Design an enzyme around this catalytic site. Sequence first.
Site, PDB file in Angstrom:
ATOM      1  N   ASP A 183       0.819  -1.211   0.000  1.00  0.00           N
ATOM      2  CA  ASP A 183       0.000   0.000   0.000  1.00  0.00           C
ATOM      3  C   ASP A 183       0.867   1.283   0.000  1.00  0.00           C
ATOM      4  O   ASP A 183       0.460   2.309   0.540  1.00  0.00           O
ATOM      5  CB  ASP A 183      -1.001  -0.044   1.184  1.00  0.00           C
ATOM      6  CG  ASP A 183      -2.285   0.775   1.063  1.00  0.00           C
ATOM      7  OD1 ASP A 183      -2.610   1.220  -0.060  1.00  0.00           O
ATOM      8  OD2 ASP A 183      -2.972   0.949   2.089  1.00  0.00           O
ATOM      9  N   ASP A 189       0.707   3.298   7.738  1.00  0.00           N
ATOM     10  CA  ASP A 189      -0.361   2.375   7.346  1.00  0.00           C
ATOM     11  C   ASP A 189       0.226   1.014   6.935  1.00  0.00           C
ATOM     12  O   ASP A 189       0.440   0.739   5.746  1.00  0.00           O
ATOM     13  CB  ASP A 189      -1.284   2.992   6.271  1.00  0.00           C
ATOM     14  CG  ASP A 189      -2.721   2.496   6.269  1.00  0.00           C
ATOM     15  OD1 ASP A 189      -3.064   1.657   7.125  1.00  0.00           O
ATOM     16  OD2 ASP A 189      -3.504   2.959   5.416  1.00  0.00           O
ATOM     17  N   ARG A 235      -0.143   9.380  -0.253  1.00  0.00           N
ATOM     18  CA  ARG A 235      -1.183   9.580   0.779  1.00  0.00           C
ATOM     19  C   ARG A 235      -0.881   8.817   2.080  1.00  0.00           C
ATOM     20  O   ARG A 235      -1.331   9.248   3.144  1.00  0.00           O
ATOM     21  CB  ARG A 235      -2.587   9.229   0.245  1.00  0.00           C
ATOM     22  CG  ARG A 235      -2.787   7.744  -0.054  1.00  0.00           C
ATOM     23  CD  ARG A 235      -3.895   7.448  -1.042  1.00  0.00           C
ATOM     24  NE  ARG A 235      -3.618   6.192  -1.741  1.00  0.00           N
ATOM     25  CZ  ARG A 235      -3.970   4.990  -1.295  1.00  0.00           C
ATOM     26  NH1 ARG A 235      -4.637   4.867  -0.153  1.00  0.00           N
ATOM     27  NH2 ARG A 235      -3.652   3.903  -1.983  1.00  0.00           N
ATOM     28  N   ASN A 236      -0.104   7.700   1.980  1.00  0.00           N
ATOM     29  CA  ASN A 236       0.316   6.865   3.102  1.00  0.00           C
ATOM     30  C   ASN A 236       1.713   7.219   3.608  1.00  0.00           C
ATOM     31  O   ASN A 236       2.246   6.541   4.481  1.00  0.00           O
ATOM     32  CB  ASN A 236       0.188   5.374   2.770  1.00  0.00           C
ATOM     33  CG  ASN A 236      -1.223   4.930   2.491  1.00  0.00           C
ATOM     34  OD1 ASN A 236      -2.212   5.502   2.979  1.00  0.00           O
ATOM     35  ND2 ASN A 236      -1.349   3.905   1.679  1.00  0.00           N
TER      36      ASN A 236
END
Length: 270
Positions: free
Chosen positions: A128, A146, A132-133
């Site tokens: 992932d 995350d 954004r993470n």
Amino acid sequence: EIDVSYVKIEEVIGAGEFGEVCRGRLKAPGKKESCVAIKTLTERQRREFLSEASIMGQFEHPNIIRLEGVVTNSMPVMILTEFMENGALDSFLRLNDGQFTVIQLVGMLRGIASGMRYLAEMSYVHRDLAARNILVNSNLVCKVSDFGLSRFLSSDPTYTSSKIPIRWTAPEAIAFRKFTSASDAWSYGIVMWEVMSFGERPYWDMSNQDVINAIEQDYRLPPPPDCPTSLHQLMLDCWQKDRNARPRFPQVVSALDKMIRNPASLKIVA
């Protein structure tokens, strides 16, 4: 691990899997009051929520989000981590569009690559990795966050899945659920493009199917405006169709270090 009497919750900063993500205070005796991020909370989901804290606790690196502790014996069950004053990297760069130099952005990507080099070394696959993470602190230091989809991987070490970020995922990971450090290398390539384009959406408004179709056509994202050729070339290496042709994260860190060593190679743009 942490007693509630030392925890104070403030405004909601994000929306997690098992619940809310808030800003807050942690005043433990014998130490000053510190800024923390509080993650809040099905019985299996409780094991999955606490597993992320279990993973985070095993890590020690300047580019991996540090765990402060957990509220175990009390309600609600909370996970405490270091606070990242600037939040998500993509939204931070969209807001500060054209407010950083190439060397600053390269420092950000060098940070992300070191954190990812650490994850591979620890035998972990992120699955992932997206801007954004990636979280940003006051001094502009980037950290991997995350670890919900993160999995522990001799021979060819692969994690085969049964919630996949299509435009950030390698072909063989979408098509055959094959997750390896090489599929994380592909994701990093996308993160590099997101960083150099100041938070532009990967593949613009193209639907997920248009993205899968573009990758099959051998189309690769172009160099963002004013992006050094050497950084785009490094992205193209991460985006090699053959997972085995992609560079390993120690090779990614060394290629970025060479560009920091010779800032004249970054002046070369198309």
